[model samples]
Target: LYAQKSPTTLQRITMTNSVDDALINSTKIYSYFPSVISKVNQGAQGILFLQWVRDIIDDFTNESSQKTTIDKISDVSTIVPYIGPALNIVKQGYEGNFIGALETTGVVLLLEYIPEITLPVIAALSIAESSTQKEKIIKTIDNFLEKRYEKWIEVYKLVKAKWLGTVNTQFQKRSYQMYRSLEYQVDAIKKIIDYEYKIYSGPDKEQIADEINNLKNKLEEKANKAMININIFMRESSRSFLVNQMINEAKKQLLEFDTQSKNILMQYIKANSKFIGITELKKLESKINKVFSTPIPFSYS
Candidate 1:
């Protein structure tokens, strides 16, 4: 029997279960699911926790007829911002891009999270003149990412186990957000570069186009190399050493990209100063500046 709607009529809604205890137990437990959902929605690491729950829900729903509970739980509104982008990676997993999704996840970690590691101690060390201390500090800074990558991988090991149904153990939501932002900057620069080419009346249109193509090719080459290195590092057994090696190379690539991208944009601005307005060139300037300002390996500062 369902009874009370007290305290006030406007504040009242009541319900009762008509099923036996077995069905009632499942129904009652279902009510508590959102409590777990809300808990998993709480923090940065909660992305993984919520994702773990999602994986279990997916498996459970696929195996049985209790679809309503999981469907409702999945619909629970919450705040972990990574959920939207993480959905793409989840799609990849379903479509046989599992390894690539995981690799991208690791790259996202490197770009958005590792740079958040602070080192005020480095300032005093920078001022200090002792060779040993300076050497130690440099090594520490260099190895910082390697240490973080492994710690993250340790967590991933357990998460991966959960995906297999086995037992096991950043900043701005830190998944595809920065990567997608980086890509937008890249495309924006490309558009401005092409637009500058289009509006040029000079004889060196061919020259500018050639130079632009060269810059584009150079960026593609470095980007491909970075991805290949990431694939290698992910597949390899010795992650710590490889991560240390790969991180330096990755930082160097980002540094070069930032420098080279700005240089090209600056040349365009300077050459077309008479034709382009300050606002137009400044838009391109700001676009290129985002390359270095983004929270990637060498660019976080």
Candidate 2:
């Protein structure tokens, strides 16, 4: 590796059946190094066979995937233990160079590797109930969140804007009056149920029961609309990320080859084609024939 090029070096990945032991040994391995971690990709002579192992784990974990096997690498137990050690390196080393923001595009990418376990960790904090553990856990999380606050806010804004764009389109299409009516209907249904605990019998009960059923009738329509919005957000986020990763690469190649001539691009975008991302782009290969099978103005005529 010292003699060879970096960016693509001989990657030594230490894999073992016991992720726990694999990680423990990792420390002993790093102990040989002189408190250093930096990118040698494109070779800075900054590694041992050991630090190389660290890089393999770091790079692999850095790039996430949903494969069951892939996801297991991030199984909370194995991954969480290392955070204490990992942050210590940054805390001590930085002044330092782990290459994270000793760098642009980086702030966002680093956040990608940060796990979202706040809700689960929040439960652990609450379970402290009456112990000094309460203060410790809160302190730990507060320290963690302080470092991550910018990341957290950035993510919230992105997701918020995405949902707003999606939901606003739905409401605008439905019209202001219809949208307000739907909101009122949802509020009305909840109020109708709230009355249930108070008036469960007699003359007042009959009207409350009837009111609930009338309100419930709109629930299906409203619920389905909300479900569709959720479905849309989930699908679009997944699709958009995949496309963003591969789209430019694919587009450059596609346009280059098509312009040179095996195929001509078509214009049949779906109503939501932008969100379908690579799925729709890849579909073009299969659809190309149907597109060509039709003649010009005469096919329309």
Candidate 3:
């Protein structure tokens, strides 16, 4: 009988599931825009929709429970043909030929056996239902992105410092594996932040949402992987049960912080109508910032 006596086994089970949950939840967040950005043009919407669908499929392939259904729908034979058309439609929409986007959506829906995946187009049609709603989104877009960018940079710095602090402790303990992993992740994230900072800070702003989404996805993926590795380490650790529980609590808090911070960013990026005012925007910044300065008790000793 497989008894649940080992703390390591418990950590392995929970952390593995946590990583998968993190990936799926992240997928949902990244795909949020494609579900609502329809008025921009169906061609671009088609392309973005395919992008999110493909991403979700990629994530699903790892889950054996979903892999069978995912493979049937995501097969190259079924989906690849549409990719070229989607690209063309995006170009057509970009060039001001908007009707093709809608046409292409019709074509995809007509040919595809499954409406479940393609139904996002229906949702897009109803997005920004009124001129007032559309105007609010249009007016808030730039400032929202700018403010979230500033807040994100602050969050990244605090997170980096947390890693560095851990590295200092691990170094004193001569835990090469722990300190080295922490140091490497810090360096990797710094490179990403630096490159994305340049993109976000630059004057040329075509496909701004695309670029920001890419940046967010990259950081989230990297963070998720790093956390997964930490959990793997935790699973193998000789630490006592109480200590391991403490570490689990800390990781949960970190992930919660990450999710809340990103949720705020996404709401603004989507210009969700709920977060357009300057006062409301400032309120979000305070909420994000206040969580970071209060340190989590992450020390192992």
Candidate 4:
């Protein structure tokens, strides 16, 4: 039914089950609620509720699905503590004139009494409660207690951090790759300029000068564009320290590259000028160089 009609029903059920499983498994192993709950709560209410519900159901299922012939009475008794609260939830749903109150009450009753029988009945209740109600009942409960339930609220925060951490890490990795690629390109540009100068050390230096001018223009354009992109990424990134460091480094490199490229271009222009005397060419180069090296300060930090 879920696969054919509403796949989201299955997804919600699964999400709720996972939350319950986490809680139960932690109880069995560490015998304590993990701090991950706080992370979840801080991030999103819907996500926190999904995880909490999943953990509860998963714990119930694992304890009841044991293969031993001898009954684990203590294991079954552990769930008894949650019965009244769970029943109260069902009762509220019924009182609110929920569409499938009968089915919900039956399933809740089964879960209340038969603690050792776990065949994903909680999942069924979740589907029944959320399907016709459009998750209204579940969301209502979550919103009511999300701010008050301190532990669960913390869990939500922890989960949010986990989500953000993953995204930040991925973005930083990609940014690092781009940084390396740009560094390599800068080195290649330097080598190409040096090779052009070395190969054309003749009297007719006009061709080489033009080539150098073109190369410098291209490099300046690329460097400016790359710096802009890096700044944009820094603004978008959540990792503040990394963003700051990257922006600082990019700005430093861009300044240095511009200074050096302009210096080389000015010397070439002064050496090859035919219309102007050496003194006039030198003065022109000085003015042009000053313009190229003028700093435009940006105050982001």
Measured with C-alpha atoms, the lDDT of residue 89 in candidate 4 is: 31
| TM-score ranking from best candidate downward | 4, 1, 2, 3
Tens-digit lDDT string for candidate 2 (117-168): 1111101111222233434433433443333333333333443444345433
* Residue ranges of candidate 3 with Cα displaced over 4 Å: 1-136, 149-152, 169-301
Q: Which residue window of length 10 is worst by lDDT in model 2?
A: 117-126
lDDT assessment of candidate 4 = 0.35
Best by lDDT: 4
lDDT of 3 by residue, 201-265 (tens): 33434545564446446545544544444333333222322233324444444545455555655
Between the candidate structures 3 and 4, which one is better when assessed by lDDT? 4
**lDDT, candidates in the order shown:** 0.33, 0.31, 0.34, 0.35
Which candidate number would show the highest TM-score if scored against the true structure?
4
Give the worst 10-residue stretch by lDDT in candidate 3.
Answer: 117-126
Q: Predicted candidate 2: what Cα RMSD to the true structure? A: 34.5
In the predicted model 2, the residue pairs found to clash are 6-42, 7-41, 7-42
Task: Give per-residue CA lDDT, model 1, range 105-212, as digits (tens).
Answer: 433322221332111111111122123343443343334334433433433343333322311002223323323422332333334334434544555456445555
Off by over 4 Å in 4: 1-156, 201-221, 230-301
TM-scores of the models, in the order given: 0.22, 0.21, 0.18, 0.26
How many angstroms is residue 76 displaced in model 1 relative to the true structure, after the best TM-score fit? Answer: 38
Candidate 4: tens digits of C-alpha lDDT, residues 179-205: 543343333333433443454445545
